[PDB]
Amino acid sequence: VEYMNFNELNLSDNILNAIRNKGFEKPTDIQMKVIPLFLNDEYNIVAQARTGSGKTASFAIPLIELVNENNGIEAIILTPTRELAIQVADEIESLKGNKNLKIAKIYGGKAIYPQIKALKNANIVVGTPGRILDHINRGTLNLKNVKYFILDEADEMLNMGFIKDVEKILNACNKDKRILLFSATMPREILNLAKKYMGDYSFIKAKINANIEQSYVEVNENERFEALCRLLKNKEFYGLVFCKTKRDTKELASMLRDIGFKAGAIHGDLSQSQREKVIRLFKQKKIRILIATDVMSRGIDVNDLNCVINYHLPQNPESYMHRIGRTGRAGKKGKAISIINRREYKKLRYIERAMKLKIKKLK
Amino acid sequence: VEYMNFNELNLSDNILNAIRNKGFEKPTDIQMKVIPLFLNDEYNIVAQARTGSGKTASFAIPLIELVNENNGIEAIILTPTRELAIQVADEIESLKGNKNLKIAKIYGGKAIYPQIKALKNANIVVGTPGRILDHINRGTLNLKNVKYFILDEADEMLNMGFIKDVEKILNACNKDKRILLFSATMPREILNLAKKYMGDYSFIKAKINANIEQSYVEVNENERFEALCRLLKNKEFYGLVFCKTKRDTKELASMLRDIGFKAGAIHGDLSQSQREKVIRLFKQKKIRILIATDVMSRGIDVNDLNCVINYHLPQNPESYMHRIGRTGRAGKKGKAISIINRREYKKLRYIERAMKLKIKKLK
Whose CA is closest to B239, among B247, B231, B230? B231
How far apart, in whole angstroms, are the C-alpha atoms of residue B256 and residue B231? 13
A200 interaction partners in chain B (CB closer than 8 Å): 203-205
The residues, any chain, with a CB within 8 Å of residue B110's CB and separated by 6 or more, are none
Residue of chain A with shortest Cα separation from B30 = A200
Burial class (CB in 10 A: 0-12, 13-18, 19+), B355: middle
Burial class (CB in 10 A: 0-12, 13-18, 19+), A175: exposed
A195 interaction partners in chain B (CB closer than 8 Å): 186, 191
Q: Which amino acid is at A214?
A: Q
Kindly report the backbone phi and psi dihedral angles of residue B327, in degrees, each rounded to the nearest multiple of 5, phi listed first: -105, -25
Q: B86 to chain A nearest CA, in Å? A: 30
What are B226-233's contacts with CB under 8 Å, separation 24+? B227/B339, B228/B252, B228/B309, B228/B311, B228/B339, B229/B259, B231/B309, B231/B337, B231/B339, B232/B256, B232/B261, B232/B289, B232/B309
- Are the CB atoms for A311 and A291 separated by under 8 Å? yes
Mutate which: A30, A181, A183, A200, vs B, most B CBs within 10 A: A200
Mutate which: B32, B40, B202, vs A, most A CBs within 10 A: B202
Residue of chain A with shortest Cα separation from B188 = A188
No. of helices (H) and no. of strands (E), chain B: 15, 13
Whose CA is closest to B264, among B272, B273, B80, B275? B275
Residue of chain B with shortest Cα separation from A185 = B195
Judged by a CB distance cut-off of 8 A, whether residue B2 touches chain A is no
Burial class (CB in 10 A: 0-12, 13-18, 19+), B144: exposed
Contact B195 A195 (CB under 8 A): no
Is B52 annotated as belonging to a binding site?
yes
Q: Which amino acid is at A203?
A: F
B2 interaction partners in chain A (CB closer than 8 Å): none
Q: Helix A29-40 crosses helix A55-66 at what angle (to 10 degrees)?
A: 30
Contact A1 B192 (CB under 8 A): no
Judged by a CB distance cut-off of 8 A, whether residue A112 touches chain B is no
Whose CA is closest to A158, among A195, A186, A199, A197? A186
- Are the CB atoms for A205 and A185 separated by under 8 Å? no
Whose CA is closest to A334, among A87, A95, A52? A52
Is B28 annotated as belonging to a binding site?
no
Of A1, A186, A201, the CB nearest to B195: A186
Is B51 annotated as belonging to a binding site?
yes
What Å resolution does this PDB entry report? Answer: 3.0
State the DSSP H helix or E strand holding residue B255, giving kind and residue range, or none if neither.
helix B246-256
B195 interaction partners in chain A (CB closer than 8 Å): 186, 191
Contact B192 A188 (CB under 8 A): yes
How far apart, in whole angstroms, are the C-alpha atoms of residue A46 and residue A205? 8
A1 interaction partners in chain B (CB closer than 8 Å): 42
How far apart, in whole angstroms, are the C-alpha atoms of residue A275 and residue A63? 29
The residues, any chain, with a CB within 8 Å of residue A135's CB and separated by 6 or more, are A106, A112, A115, A127, A141
3-state secondary structure of B305: coil
How far apart, in whole angstroms, are the C-alpha atoms of residue A240 and residue B204? 44
B204 interaction partners in chain A (CB closer than 8 Å): 200
Chain pair A-B, CB pairs under 8 angstroms: 36
Is B53 annotated as belonging to a binding site?
yes
Mutate which: B42, B195, B211, B356, vs A, most A CBs within 10 A: B195
- DSSP assignment of B56-105 equals HHHHHHHHHHHS-SSSS--EEEE-S-HHHHHHHHHHHHHHH-SS---EEE
What is the number of other CB atoms lying within 10 angstroms of the CB of residue B331?
Answer: 14
- DSSP assignment of B308-362 equals EEESS--SSHHHHHHHSTTT--TTS-EEEEEEEESTTHHHHHHHHHHTT-----B
Q: A12 to chain B nearest CA, in Å? A: 23
3-state secondary structure of B300: coil
Sign of CA dihedral A141, A143, A148, A149: positive
- Residues tagged in the binding site annotation of A: 49-56
Of B42, B195, B202, the CB nearest to A1: B42
Contact B200 A205 (CB under 8 A): yes
B200 interaction partners in chain A (CB closer than 8 Å): 203-205
Contact B203 A203 (CB under 8 A): yes
DSSP state of B183: E
Mutate which: B37, B41, B189, B200, vs A, most A CBs within 10 A: B200
Contact B192 A194 (CB under 8 A): no
Contact A205 B203 (CB under 8 A): no
Q: After which residues is chain A broken (C to N over 2.5 A)?
A: none
Of B192, B194, B205, the CB nearest to A200: B205
The residues, any chain, with a CB within 8 Å of residue A113's CB and separated by 6 or more, are none
Burial class (CB in 10 A: 0-12, 13-18, 19+), A271: exposed
Q: Which domains does chain B have, with CATH numbers?
A: 1-208 (3.40.50.300), 212-353 (3.40.50.300)
What is the number of other CB atoms lying within 10 angstroms of the CB of residue B284?
Answer: 9
Q: B326 to chain A nearest CA, in Å? A: 24
B199 interaction partners in chain A (CB closer than 8 Å): 203, 205
